[PDB]
Symmetry: C3
Subunit: 234 residues, 3 copies
């Protein structure tokens, strides 16, 4: 009900189907996406294409099931080509970064608005981001909610190519003709670059402090009222 | 004496004021910067802009006439420790060349807004010196490992243009631009910023020298080549290196 | 017999001279390179230029003591890694497979306009050592490394310059003039910086799952299918076993 699944050649296309909420991840969508990734190998598919219906790839969230989704993607023997058709924001950016490769629409952008919201990310989100946009641009994205445009994303390697869903499927079909064991090996080693990192004690303290703070409430109220937030640092 | 401090909106601008030596660091200047970083939170500032007076951001280290030159490297370590530990984001307004200790200082900032005119350089290979591990790892994270090799192995200058390319510069801009950005950042959720800063700084750049590193670090600093480079500059002639 | 060694100023130029096979590595070529790197400091040189004769820098591994060859190759990298001399790779053409590994083991790279770099391992069903993957990642950026490794995509010289894999675009002559400058720098500064830069964590032992997948790749029928398909000029039909 929340995703579409089709297969052409040896490519499985999984489409996020909550366009009315710009494909925000809820429970049912996260669960169905998990099952789809897990069952992806059951037929004859050798590559996956992951994309969103409508104008957004994924506008955010709407932690346990979510963590299991990332685990399923990280553990999958098949390469996932993200056809990032539009904005990938927050949990949506996380999802885009968990893809093995990325084909990005010219109007798509990437963003962690966490500093606007008073929240804090897990270490993997931060490390994978630094690896993909470079540490310097990661600092700006993390510390000041900077948007990463399709064009800058191509410049840094966050986007592998700029193009359409059709382009992503053409590339996925090529990839599906390559040697699956070579692909599996390279995927495992690359994912084990150290991005998958347990929070240090001081990170967890700061994480819990941010999440449990009064500023989280102030950010929601100001955004809901479309007015500038008066944060307190508590 | 050697630094200026103003506050506007919620931005604390700290200005290195030793323009006669192109803002080159020594004992006193480093001490006064440390204090200013540490005190920066007392009022209601939520961001720091760090910049230099005149044509230079910081051209390195001088130490001649410095009564406590011996304590310089330790006080410099303390400055870096204070910037790392500071809850506020530091926006480096790199108004001009950042060389040696100045590039280190620029890299310790959280964000960088760079003058079209500025460049970054580690001239260590010209002087026979060796860098701490952090300097090498933070540079690699900022310019990419490939460019970091050319910078360290051949004293390659990094222009503002290429700095923007790689991410070393987040923006090419003036002090004014840096300050407007800092004003925006000072309006974001301080506790989110605190978390991200700590995680980002804990990427592993802060790394203890391995035993072979320390061995090579001491051979370089202890070498006659270091003396030769200083003499050569002073005599305005190419240095004749010996590898000892 | 299989390398050329010349010295001008304080720059030793080592030339891979097997152009008929696009400078592909075999035991004798690896052994002679190893010796040339090891003894490069015996005279008065303080910088090394490494380059290929003809159109290619190094197209890969040949073999056609070939069971005593992966060991010899590891030794070449060790000697390059341990060398006090900075090695400027003049990448005069394609660097592929073991050629790409060799190019990355260089301290700096000056790359010809028509040169490209490539790991075609996913086309052949093979798996790389961890270092090849980590060092590639550091040089082209994690994103591009993913495309190169999961899809065998080539990296052109212009993109190499963009990422830092190429420090400059230029000729062998450019690389030699650059090396002559570096040879006038302080050797102990260079030695330290090289050691730390190489000790970035790229020299990584394979994790358990890395080794499992690596052995499974190298022992698979798919390696065979890849070869037979090339010899039959036809699409491979891999089985994932
Ligand atoms: C194996 C591949 C893999 C599996 C999971 C992740 C991320 C995904 C991200 C999600 F997408 F789910 F949002 N995510 N969100 C929260 C967490 C998380 O790890 N929480 C524990 C924690 C406690 C305290 C603290 F301070 C920091 N972290 C987490 N892991 C990345 C890669
Ligand atoms: C936590 C935040 C933080 C604190 C300090 C640093 C750097 C700054 C740099 C300076 F800017 F000061 F120059 N710097 N310079 C020298 C050292 C240093 O630590 N020396 C001990 C040592 C001995 C032998 C060896 F081989 C290498 N290192 C050192 N630390 C970076 C981050
Ligand atoms: C100190 C500087 C240094 C020395 C050697 C290397 C690489 C070079 C590369 C070559 F260019 F030779 F091909 N190479 N090839 C194979 C191996 C290797 O170490 N294999 C063991 C292994 C076990 C399990 C597994 F899963 C993968 N590999 C290996 N090491 C890198 C840096």
């Amino acid at each position: 009900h929340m995703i579409g699944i089709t297969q052409a050649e040896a490519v499985l296309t999984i489409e996020l189907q909550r366009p009315e909420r710009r494909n925000a991840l809820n429970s049912q969508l996260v669960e169905e996406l998990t099952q789809a990734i897990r069952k992806a190998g059951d037929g004859s598919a050798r590559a996956i294409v992951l994309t969103g219906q409508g104008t957004a790839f994924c506008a955010g969230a709407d932690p346990d099931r979510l963590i299991e989704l990332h685990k399923a993607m990280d553990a999958s023997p098949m390469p996932v080509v993200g056809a990032i058709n539009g904005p990938a924001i927050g949990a949506g950016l996380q999802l885009a970064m968990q893809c093995d490769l990325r084909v990005v629409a010219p109007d798509a952008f990437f963003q962690f608005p966490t500093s606007k919201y008073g929240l804090a990310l897990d270490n993997w989100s931060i490390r994978r981001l630094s690896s993909l946009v470079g540490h310097g641009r990661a600092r700006a994205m993390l510390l000041s909610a900077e948007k990463l445009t399709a064009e800058i994303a191509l410049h840094t390697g966050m986007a592998n190519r700029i193009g359409t869903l059709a382009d992503a499927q053409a590339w996925a079909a090529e990839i599906a003709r390559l040697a699956p064991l070579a692909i599996q090996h390279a995927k495992r080693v690359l994912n084990d670059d150290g991005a998958i990192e347990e929070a240090w004690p001081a990170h967890k303290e700061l994480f819990d402090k941010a999440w449990g703070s009064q500023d989280v409430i102030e950010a929601q109220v100001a955004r809901m009222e479309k007015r500038p937030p008066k944060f307190q640092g508590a």
